[PDB]
């Protein structure tokens, strides 16, 4: 058992969902029609891939997933795309009019009209689980649906599913691939609202992904298609421990025990390696030592920040492919005596290590080279607070003049929700500062 239900909210959430589930299918040998030849137990099973896939009597393997958007055109591409047979029509939910990059519309005006239907469809997935573990919520910070509706959904999920775990994959706004101006507002609002209802959240900075695609994959001007394929690999590395088995496999929940020292401190920094093109990977093996060392090169982080100017509270290494502990241990020993790695004084310094033997897969016609071994580092660093600081500052600049606020007030919100949300963010930044001060 131990099923996980994925929920994809808004354009960013949905389209990243496409990338992930396509990648999952390739990893498990699941065809676009849902058929999986290597699976001999027809109509059910308790295999590791069953955490993410349910099974019909006709042998179809169905994602434990709901797609939600307040506007239909993004999800419509899923309904008519390559993997349309994968999903039951009731897993794909759309309204007619989006939130127009307005949190208020996503959380209130438009969201309330569809939230009951969404909870019903999620309930129908939960009822088919023999031991539901929790949820995975994919969304942007900047969208009106990604921010507003997600926080509404997270609030309702806490009511309907008690303390059942809820994890986030959140897209942090970058101007390079955005045409919105009010995203700092939506970002601060959803973070404040969701903070109590999320157990762990993986922020993905679009600028970090954009840079990596440009510098490492030599993509002149990355698209959402380019970003999502990279993001899906990081998401895959993180969920791999839930979907595959293995002696040296360590479950995500065990890493979570180390990553979250206080409820509010639940934002791990992800670093992934190797990201390399086919052209450059030819005749060039990337050893365990080489990719491990790349985890401490800030250019490979999912979020722009400098851990070398912060403190560590946890460090996890999630390997996949041709990797054995002996090589890991040696690589780590080298790094510990050559890197700027400093822990807070109230936390042990050892690196928690996981290894899945099944190697990384690539999507056909993608940009990433197929490699024999990859690694995702999940660290808890005070430096992640830099991402809050940049966002909060953009917020302050606009809010001082009350720019764009009338759009929010017009949909029923009050200025008091803004200041309250901002104060939570100020306290959050101070929390990250306080955990880094040495003990008495």
């Amino acid at each position: 058992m131990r099923e996980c239900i994925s929920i994809h909210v808004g354009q960013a959430g949905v389209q990243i969902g496409n990338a992930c589930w396509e990648l999952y299918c390739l990893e498990h040998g699941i065809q676009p029609d849902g058929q999986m030849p290597s699976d001999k137990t027809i109509g059910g099973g308790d295999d590791s891939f069953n955490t993410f896939f349910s099974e019909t009597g006709a042998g179809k393997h169905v994602p434990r997933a709901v797609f939600v958007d307040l506007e239909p055109t993004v999800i419509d591409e899923v309904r008519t795309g390559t993997y349309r047979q994968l999903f039951h029509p009731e897993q794909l939910i759309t309204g007619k009019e989006d939130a127009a990059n307005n949190y208020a519309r996503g959380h209130y005006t438009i969201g309330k009209e569809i939230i009951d239907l969404v909870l019903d469809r999620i309930r129908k997935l939960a009822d088919q689980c023999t031991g539901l573990q929790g949820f995975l919520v994919f969304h942007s910070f900047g969208g009106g649906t990604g921010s507003g509706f997600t926080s509404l959904l997270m609030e309702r999920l806490s009511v309907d599913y008690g303390k059942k775990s809820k994890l986030e994959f959140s897209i942090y706004p970058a101007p390079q691939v955005s045409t919105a101006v009010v995203e700092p507002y939506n970002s601060i609002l959803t973070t404040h609202t969701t903070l109590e209802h999320s157990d762990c959240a993986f922020m993905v900075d679009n600028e970090a992904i954009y840079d990596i695609c440009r510098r490492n994959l030599d993509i002149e001007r990355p698209t959402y298609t380019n970003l999502n394929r990279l993001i899906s690999q990081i998401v895959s590395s993180i969920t791999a421990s839930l979907r595959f088995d293995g002696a040296l496999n360590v479950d995500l929940t065990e890493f979570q025990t180390n990553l979250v020292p206080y409820p509010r401190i639940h934002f791990p920094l992800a670093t992934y390696a190797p990201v390399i093109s086919a052209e450059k990977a030819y005749h060039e093996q990337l050893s365990v030592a080489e990719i491990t060392n790349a985890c401490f090169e800030p250019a490979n982080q999912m979020v722009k920040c400098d851990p070398r100017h912060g403190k560590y509270m946890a460090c996890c290494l999630l390997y996949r492919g041709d990797v054995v502990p002996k090589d890991v241990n040696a690589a780590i020993a080298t790094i510990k005596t050559k890197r700027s790695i400093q822990f807070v004084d109230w936390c042990p310094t050892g690196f928690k290590v996981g290894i899945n033997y099944q190697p990384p897969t690539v999507v056909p016609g993608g940009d990433l080279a197929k490699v024999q071994r990859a690694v995702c580092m999940l660290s808890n660093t005070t430096a992640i607070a830099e991402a809050w600081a940049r966002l909060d500052h953009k917020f302050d600049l606009m809010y001082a003049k009350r720019a764009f606020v009338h759009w929010y007030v017009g949909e029923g919100m009050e200025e008091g929700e803004f200041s309250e949300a901002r104060e939570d963010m100020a306290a959050l930044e101070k929390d990250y500062e306080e955990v880094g001060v040495d003990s008495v």
């Binding site: 058992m1 031991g131 303390k163 929940t253 065990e254 025990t257 180390n258 979250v260 020292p261 206080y262 409820p263 946890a314 502990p325 002996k326 241990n329 004084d345 109230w346 936390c347 042990p348 050892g350 928690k352 955990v435 003990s439 008495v440």
Partner: protein
């Protein structure tokens, strides 16, 4: 003189399975449960750990417990997996997430009655149950949290029965999560109150032995457990085979435990062997004796020279001159009589069994009740405090209904235990 065995959690079931496979080989029991050995000495006390099944099969008096089916399914598919009574597999589904509170208060509490039912069913078949033994780690949630809950309830239903534990102590060297000092500290106080013997098997020491001595550059849990099962075989040789000694658990404990709370033993074994690696020259008796007293064979990672021995027990196995054993034993003491308390006369005792373990022509198992064991608890205490100062990772516990006060109490009574050891070291 039956003994009821219980193994709880991942670590508890893995060393437990190892234990049963080792002594089954010593008693000539195959994985089907059929005896095929060549000595009646193998069967004279086989009822201590085994039940006789109609159709002359021997079934381990063992109860297997976990909050998740993962490791127990590995057991059932293991080498001797089929030897265990299927009804004695008791498991939940939710797991414990390396959380003492989940094991002791919530998830474990929901399952603990089912385990007791099996315990009772095995006890009522015993002509005269002499006691219980438990294998578990202290660093996780099931073995640590539910294991001590189990021990508390067993003492309620069987207040006059001996309870002994083989307990794996956590170490940053061999570590799963950062909350292990929390779980260990909470568990240690339970053990102080409700066990008669606790064998302090330190994963740090087990690592160092595999590394520094057995020259295994990357030791696994499997390598670590080879040392544990070899030690458990030796500690229970006394009970499983005829010889000089025929004390029941209670008589054994009486002569080893001068004060009720100070019952945490430093185990040792000689010669130290890595799995598979044959070696052909047997040790001379002076070699056995010198090694078993050397800190490098200790499995508690405490320096015995930093404390004093209250009592010592040593069991030698194999065909050898016990007169020579006598002389070497009294050599070691009379050489180092400053590491033995002088107010417990003749506190160093020895015994021999003719039957050696598999692979060795002779061996020796060490059981030391030293005040140096306080180093183990001080180590755990320091690591506890470093996090608890900042109330770090506490939300995992408060979320299950626990209060900070219970941690403060746990911290305090382990510091009392430490100071209590210091009292007798300076006597």
């Amino acid at each position: 003189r039956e003994i009821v065995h219980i193994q709880a959690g991942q670590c508890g079931n893995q060393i437990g399975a190892k234990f049963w496979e080792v002594i089954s080989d010593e008693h000539g029991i195959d994985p089907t449960g059929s005896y095929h050995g060549d000595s009646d000495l193998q069967l004279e006390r086989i009822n201590v750990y085994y039940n006789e099944a109609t159709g002359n099969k021997y079934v381990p008096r063992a109860i297997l417990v976990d909050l998740e089916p993962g490791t127990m399914d590995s057991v059932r598919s293991g080498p001797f997996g089929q030897i265990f009574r299927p009804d004695n597999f008791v498991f939940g589904q939710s797991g414990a997430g390396n959380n003492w509170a989940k094991g002791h208060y919530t998830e474990g509490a929901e399952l603990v009655d089912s385990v007791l039912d099996v315990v009772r069913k095995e006890s009522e078949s015993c002509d005269c149950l002499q006691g219980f033994q438990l294998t578990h780690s202290l660093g996780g949630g099931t073995g640590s949290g539910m294991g001590t809950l189990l021990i508390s309830k067993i003492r309620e239903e069987y207040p006059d029965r001996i309870m002994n534990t083989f307990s794996v102590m956590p170490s940053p060297k061999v570590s799963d999560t950062v909350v292990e000092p929390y779980n260990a500290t909470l568990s240690v106080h339970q053990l102080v109150e409700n066990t008669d013997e606790t064998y302090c098997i330190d994963n740090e020491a087990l690592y160092d032995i595999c590394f520094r001595t057995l020259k295994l550059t990357t030791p696994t849990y499997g390598d670590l457990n080879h040392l544990v099962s070899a030690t458990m075989s030796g500690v229970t040789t006394c009970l499983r085979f005829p010889g000089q000694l025929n004390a029941d658990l209670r008589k054994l404990a009486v002569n080893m435990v001068p004060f009720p709370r100070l019952h945490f033993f430093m185990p040792g074994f000689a010669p130290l062997t890595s799995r598979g690696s044959q070696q052909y020259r047997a040790l001379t008796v002076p070699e056995l004796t010198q090694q078993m007293f050397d800190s490098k064979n200790m499995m508690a990672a405490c320096d015995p020279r930093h404390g004093r021995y209250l009592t010592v027990a040593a069991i030698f196995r194999g065909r050898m001159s016990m007169k020579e054993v006598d002389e070497q034993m009294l050599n070691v003491q009379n050489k180092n009589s400053s590491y033995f308390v002088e107010w417990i006369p003749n506190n160093v005792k020895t015994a021999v069994c003719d039957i050696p373990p598999r692979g060795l022509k002779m061996s020796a198992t060490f059981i030391g009740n030293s005040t140096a064991i306080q180093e183990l608890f001080k180590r755990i205490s320091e690591q506890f405090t470093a996090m608890f100062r900042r109330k770090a990772f506490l939300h995992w516990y408060t979320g299950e209904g626990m209060d900070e006060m219970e941690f403060t109490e746990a911290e305090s009574n382990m510091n009392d235990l430490v100071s209590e050891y210091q009292q007798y070291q300076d006597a």
